[PDB]
Design an enzyme around this catalytic site. Sequence first.
Site, PDB file in Angstrom:
ATOM      1  N   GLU A 357       0.737  -1.378  -0.035  1.00 43.91           N
ATOM      2  CA  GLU A 357       0.064   0.029  -0.023  1.00 43.91           C
ATOM      3  C   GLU A 357       0.608   1.181   0.047  1.00 43.91           C
ATOM      4  O   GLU A 357       0.602   2.285  -0.708  1.00 43.91           O
ATOM      5  CB  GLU A 357      -0.945  -0.018   1.318  1.00 43.91           C
ATOM      6  N   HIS A 487     -16.615 -10.331 -11.238  1.00 44.78           N
ATOM      7  CA  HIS A 487     -16.159  -9.358 -12.433  1.00 44.78           C
ATOM      8  C   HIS A 487     -17.181  -9.457 -13.562  1.00 44.78           C
ATOM      9  O   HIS A 487     -17.323  -8.445 -14.279  1.00 44.78           O
ATOM     10  CB  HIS A 487     -14.567  -9.536 -12.818  1.00 44.78           C
TER      11      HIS A 487
HETATM   12 ZN    ZN Z   1      -2.562  -2.761  -4.449  1.00 47.77          ZN
END
Ligand code: ZN
Lengths: 597, 188
Positions: A357, A487
């Site tokens: 992150e 998805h």
């Molecule tokens: Zn990521």
Amino acid sequence: STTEDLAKTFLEKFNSEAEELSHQSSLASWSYNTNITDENVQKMNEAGARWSAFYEEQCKLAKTYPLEEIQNLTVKRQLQALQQSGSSVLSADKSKRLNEILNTMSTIYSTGKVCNPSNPQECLLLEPGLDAIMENSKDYNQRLWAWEGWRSEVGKQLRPLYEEYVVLKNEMARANNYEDYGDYWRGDYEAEGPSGYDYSRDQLIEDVERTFAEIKPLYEHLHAYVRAKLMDTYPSHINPTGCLPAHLLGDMWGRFWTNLYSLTVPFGQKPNIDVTDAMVDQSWDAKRIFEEAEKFFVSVGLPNMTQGFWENSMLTEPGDGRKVVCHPTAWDLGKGDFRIKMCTKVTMDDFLTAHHEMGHIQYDMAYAVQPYLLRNGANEGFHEAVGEIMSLSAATPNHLKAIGLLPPDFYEDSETEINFLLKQALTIVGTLPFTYMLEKWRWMVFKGEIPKEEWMKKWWEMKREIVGVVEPVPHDETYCDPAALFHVANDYSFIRYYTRTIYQFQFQEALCQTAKHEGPLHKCDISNSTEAGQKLLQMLSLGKSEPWTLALERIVGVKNMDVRPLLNYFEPLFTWLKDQNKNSFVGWSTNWSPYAH
Amino acid sequence: CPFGEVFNATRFASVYAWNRKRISNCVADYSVLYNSASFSTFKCYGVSPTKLNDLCFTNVYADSFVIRGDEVRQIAPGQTGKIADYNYKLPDDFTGCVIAWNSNNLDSKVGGNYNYLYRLFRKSNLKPFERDISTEIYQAGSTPCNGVEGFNCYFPLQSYGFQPTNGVGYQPYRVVVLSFELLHAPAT
Ligand SMILES: [Zn+2]
Ligand SMILES: *[C@@H]1O[C@H](CO)[C@@H](O)[C@H](O)[C@H]1NC(C)=O
């Protein structure tokens, strides 16, 4: 004045107001995600209303400036982004129906239950019930009723909706100068930039197919090793030269083979390297984890985190009664405001996701110099590839020894290293044929090359031939098994998972060569290489302001996908797998069915 | 001299309508300024910062405004950018000192402070020390605006958004420009 003079002025107004409205939406959505509240749901939806509305009018205005009338590429690239708007061209009644379909599919996917034939009182949702089965069960029959029930309860409902979805989505796409809806999706890789950095939407198919051909030998050997180990668990139903039955793959779809690790681990007498225990004995907290991620990026010459990053992030689940959403995200809120939201725990996993992150935040910080519209990854694959290579480096035993979570005398056994690469492959190599084959089907359906009378016929032909996976029950055209994956039912393109996997090893190899790391690619740690950091920043700072081909060239030296770094990463596992497979068949017949008898 | 009503003033001006205070007939202590370490920028042009305390001048102007941290570089001779071109322009032959300090604690509010504005569009660059406070619609193309916003017709001012969580480059900075004139008048 010039069309280009007016475009510049138009973009300047856009940028200044967009940066306001985008920032206020970010701030309002952050308040909701860090304090779930019915009021914060209102403030969030209103800020997204103002921002959506403005963004829509502005896309219409952008079309008044014809690109052919515009010299500067940076102006051209911004306008191009603005005037890819969507189903605005679609008639109101058709547009209203498309949205009806989109929401109906999403809602029957998110709410459908599947009941046990053995116990009608046991009706489970995908989450958590069916996921628990598909990821944990070693019972052929249990996995089968979960797998078939889902594809029959929700998939059959999706079937007529998805037929209307294709027709309408195609209608919109053609009315936007695109061949079909799939050609529209391939739009994200189009590049009309300088010199020989151009890239056509049709080139993407060619490049996804050429690279996949180079990956299949590795996959075929992973497939044969796993087939042999699954014979030891499902002897009645595994054929030593056939496809793998689709419901035994460790999740609902076979999208990843990660959960087959307990069945297939090369040397189950060796434990995984897990520094979690060392972190607890050294009394690490959430602050120490992110401090160490920060040290990592500084070691390669990248900026520290901002002071507002430390002050405004949510690095720890709150205990003031505030209900939050715990899924880890990296936020570029605009106007210099960078944050991470994570319910960090003192584990090796969360230590690695923090580097992941923070890699996103580093990309965000680097391209803040770009105009608003170019503040993004070079294409849809770049951002995750960048976050992922930070994980690769942070996890290596070399790095964990330098950090002090591994003893300075630690030595990795060849067996432990094969155990690790194999687990990597079950996730990383295992999803490549799945991902390519899924999107290849959708591309051909949108193209009209698969008529509706052959949809499920061709789905399972390609799943057999490309993925080496065979359906445990025949499925006529009442079924819609592709739509039974999140998805597909929720209208997201899928090829990004393929391309980012290739980018990520290209990135990692080029930086490791810059840091002059010798030895196997999978052991490389880029820490303390400021040369590697500079080469990395050459790409990150560009954002979406250049063709992705040139952004790729800046860091890795070539302007297209190349799978050799991926193959080089796994070459130790490859030569091990060939030895293991030497007395077994490698490849699979596309004719054997678990139901042929 | 009363540098304390300009610097430590409660309210500050938007950059486009920048304030000017005349300082003349005045006992001038510049040590107090360069002794305070709150200031983040203190560049001087022509005069030396310490050597300033012993020079006498014909008059002193104190221009004060608020901008973004990213734009404090533009308040300098020879600069370009929206501020230097359309809001506050320093002459290439400038003599004086630019003094700036972060004012996030005063000028930024939760939810946002949109009261400070800057000029986004102008038909040409400001002359040194020009103050454009007009609000006519900017007419970007050949078609006329008729005093109302429209296609290629933009209102020329634009708000900053100052929330305290912004990055440093987007935080409010209070600026004081001190202009020292030396010849063509008696000293004061
Ligand atoms: Zn990521
Ligand atoms: C206001 O700023 C001036 C700087 O000219 C400083 O001398 C003074 O101490 C400040 N006000 C107070 C109450 O300290």
